Symmetry: D2
Subunit: 319 residues, 4 copies
């Protein structure tokens, strides 16, 4: 098994951690800013997903989980982290403060072969959205690897399907999310930019300049949605579009993409592990070409499972 | 001074009242509500959203007072028995939402009222009027039971008009994002997808546009301001500046005070208590492929709307004389 | 025996969900204004508690292969209890909390009415874990389960009374004219009857306790914040131990003692009437105690209904 | 006439500013923030909770115009490095939250400023003032770094002061319901109980009450109004009417403008942009056993406090001149 390390224990760090403790590899370390007592608690009790299906026990310099030992490091400098020291092949980077390669390469300085960013990268070797472009992963070329963002992860797979089947002329989109970002979240809809359409240039390059978007932050706890109005190149029906997605979910994108025929609300998708959950009842078609598709996604649960999917894959290509 | 009454005292009725008392062109006389005098007074005075009432109120067994004026109160569940001919009231603003069917709302008429105005999309109604749009299709002689449609339609109809007239419209899909079936579920923690009638309502006020616009809604747990987010294909080449300019011009012009263009990076709460039917978010306008166009329209789903209601009520008042 | 739920609001919904995992009785019928396809859904999918087999039909349902009949009526006297052979009716609309109203059920052929709210002139009020032994099947027909707040306060306030004795109390309940206003923005101060009601389940505590409610914008979990002066010297450890004991003891399953540091949403889908927040307990000058108890205002209370319903059924059976 | 400067532009600095600029007794001539003028401008202009700024604001490169008054902008993370000397700056309102030690706060003085005022409770500060309570215990010659405590302490202390003067206090417990380990957790869903320093703090402002009161906090997701729920035992016999009169009297009196008595059936949002330290919710006063008393006091946990800051800043200014 291959030793992995999580760096930072924010929300993503925690969720990733949670579903990671899987066969293909093993988490042997966390570098965090919180004392064993506190990590301990965070792992076990969840504000959004409930309570920990496993077991947890706190100690001075390390942690135990299901009898699995985890050393606890507190260093804000990756240069000084002991990977090669600790047998650490791959670093999962959840701090969000080293998102740039120049600054992320320090994990490799310090004895780690690979860094996987749980956010969008700067000057990274590659960006991989699982279910879409993963063939593009070249193990001998790439060291710092981006998982993109959770919106990109929802958008790319959806947009991919449309384009393969019906072709994409162009499209506009709105990510309804759970500068102006300064402002109080609780009383407001907050409009803003999104990078997730610009990110497509990285994982789906034929689609360059074809899609643009924006975000609306709203005061809802967990589940977000992508609202996508695209024009296609050939005649389609509500029916034909929904069946593309029905097909693919039983198919190539099983576990990446879900089709929901059923009338649910955003919180029904709490703790769903797909990147995109197509809301079948909201598919619209105008003039046989113009297409609206709504896709739900959990902001953390889905994303983090694609992080473990990616980590699994890298671990697999080192072997 | 034309004598008018408000049936029902929901948020609409309350909010209409608030700025209606403050309109001179007609005078408010009566009301009908299930609320006791002390209660109604409080309701006028304190508001969670728009803040404290500008003015002064006082409370009595069967009547009120506001800012120097006498208002009668009734509790009559039934329109017919409603004592209209007596208090001598021409026009009944129907805000209860129980009487939006022509027949139902024709009782006010029978009971001595002339013309009656629905603060909601009406059924089998003589006429639906969105102000800034078709307010011209109102013939006082032909129409008695009149609807002001829904506040969403009042945001969407003006935007869609400016685009149609200027660039022509091909197709559109709108999503509406509503501040507070699937509707049975608890909306506090949820984004609730649902249907909207605002796109089909256009058939009533903008008939050349039938079948061109369809849409849906998203209810979010936000207190007041809502938005319409529209994606249309237009009939000729446009840009961001061109679109945005069309809205600036019209907000200085013929749509003055109906439609507003905002250039700033604001957030939904900032349009709180705003009186425009549609507030265009200028930084949000986008154009793809020269044809496809995103527009964002903020609207306060109580305040803007209930201003058009005063508006609609005073036209009828300015007719009916003539 | 055969039980009917009148009303299918949030309360009736949770009761029903809880009942189905019970052998003691079987819910045969629901009266309510919803369509079956909707009713199916409300059941099948829960906003707060997560998720549930089900299927629908014009006039009836199938939950776990079991036939639930669906009525839609607003007058109870005209419901077919006798026809349906329903002995006990769970009154969850809370339109009928007055008794002279709650009886229409009795005239429609139902033996016993169980109010999921405080009664008005009810034959008795029952808080399970406190006064249930005061239930007399002979004399008592319309029976009130009190409120979810009364079900938190009463098991906590007696444990305190028996062990240390109570002198005085003021309390605040923090709930998830003034009532009318939007709950979404504000803290809404309002009245509570939960203190007044002890006078019907713990009469010795009469006018020793008063209270008020703070309505706050949170989805499910509520808390009671109680400041009592007791009759003898205590310590935080003394008080917290009374609860730990009672939670393994007579009040097991009704009351629970939580030692870990948690927030309200942690107590979601918890069946207990009161969950003591052991890290919040305070003592001032030996006699003045602060206790904080969480309660799921739906789940817990609901389970206390299935417990009351269960009791009454057994009692009839004898 | 006395040039004042705000250091930091968060909710508090901003709210303080918004209120200060409208004050005659003294002058806001500079702001030190990490933010570029265009944003400061937008932040003063548009307020999410309190609404839109009553007035006018223009952003320029190195400064602003606010109600036609020139406010110099600074961005230097180093108090030592600020030209309080050249700008003629006597008092510095310190709102960043980072300089709350006296070790740190004193710099603004090393940099040429007479007095510093912390918009939080102080760590090893010279003095802590709650206006309406301990004001006159300010000593200009011996006190350099002054603390205005927290918003809660500011609610608790006038209230507790009132009850004690009239009825005497034996014992108290309290709960603060706060708007906006356990603090770690996600806030939008839950009632989060936590600790509160508001009761210890009374040790600095009303020392004789030391040991008599303790409290806790309950954080709930509401925009901006907070409350103090107080259960206290008094030394002598009271009625609901007696208590409520003590506050009615005080509010027309010694505490006018600090303490309000609300008789009306109101909810928390009705007190938004109220300037008082505590608003007594008169319909919630209870008395059990003639002795045990419950009082509820609302406070706007930005706007009231902010105003106190300006009251305290005003007070400092009026001494320097008294020299």
């Amino acid at each position: 098994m291959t030793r992995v390390a999580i760096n930072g224990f924010g929300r993503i760090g925690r969720m990733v951690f949670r579903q990671a403790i899987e066969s293909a590899f093993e988490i042997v370390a966390i570098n965090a800013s919180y004392p064993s007592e506190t990590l301990a608690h965070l792992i076990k009790y969840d504000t959004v997903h409930g309570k920990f299906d496993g077991t947890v026990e706190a100690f001075e310099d390390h942690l135990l989980v299901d009898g699995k030992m985890i050393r606890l490091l507190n260093n804000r400098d990756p240069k000084e982290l002991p990977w090669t020291d600790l047998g650490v092949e791959v670093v999962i980077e959840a701090t969000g403060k080293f998102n740039s390669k120049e600054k992320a390469i320090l994990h490799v300085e310090a004895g780690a072969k690979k860094v996987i960013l749980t956010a969008p990268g700067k000057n990274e070797d590659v960006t991989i959205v699982v279910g879409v472009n993963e063939d593009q992963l070249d193990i001998t070329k790439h060291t710092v690897i981006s998982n993109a963002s959770c919106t990109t992860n929802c958008l790319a797979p959806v947009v991919k399907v449309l384009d393969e089947q019906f072709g994409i002329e162009n499209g506009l989109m709105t990510t309804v999310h759970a500068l102006r970002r300064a402002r109080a979240c609780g009383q407001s809809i907050i409009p803003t930019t999104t990078g997730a359409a610009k990110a497509l240039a990285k994982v789906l390059p034929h689609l360059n300049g074809k899609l643009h978007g924006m975000a609306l932050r709203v005061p809802t706890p967990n589940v977000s949605l992508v609202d996508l109005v695209v024009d296609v190149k050939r005649d389609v029906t509500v029916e034909a579009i929904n069946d593309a997605f029905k097909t693919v979910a039983n198919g190539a994108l099983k576990g990446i993409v879900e089709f929901s025929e059923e009338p649910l609300v955003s919180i029904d998708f709490n703790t769903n592990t797909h990147s995109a959950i197509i809301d079948g009842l909201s598919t619209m078609v105008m003039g046989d070409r113009k297409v609206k598709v709504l896709a739900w996604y959990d902001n953390e649960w889905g994303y983090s499972r694609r992080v473990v999917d990616l980590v699994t894959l890298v671990v697999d290509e080192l072997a």
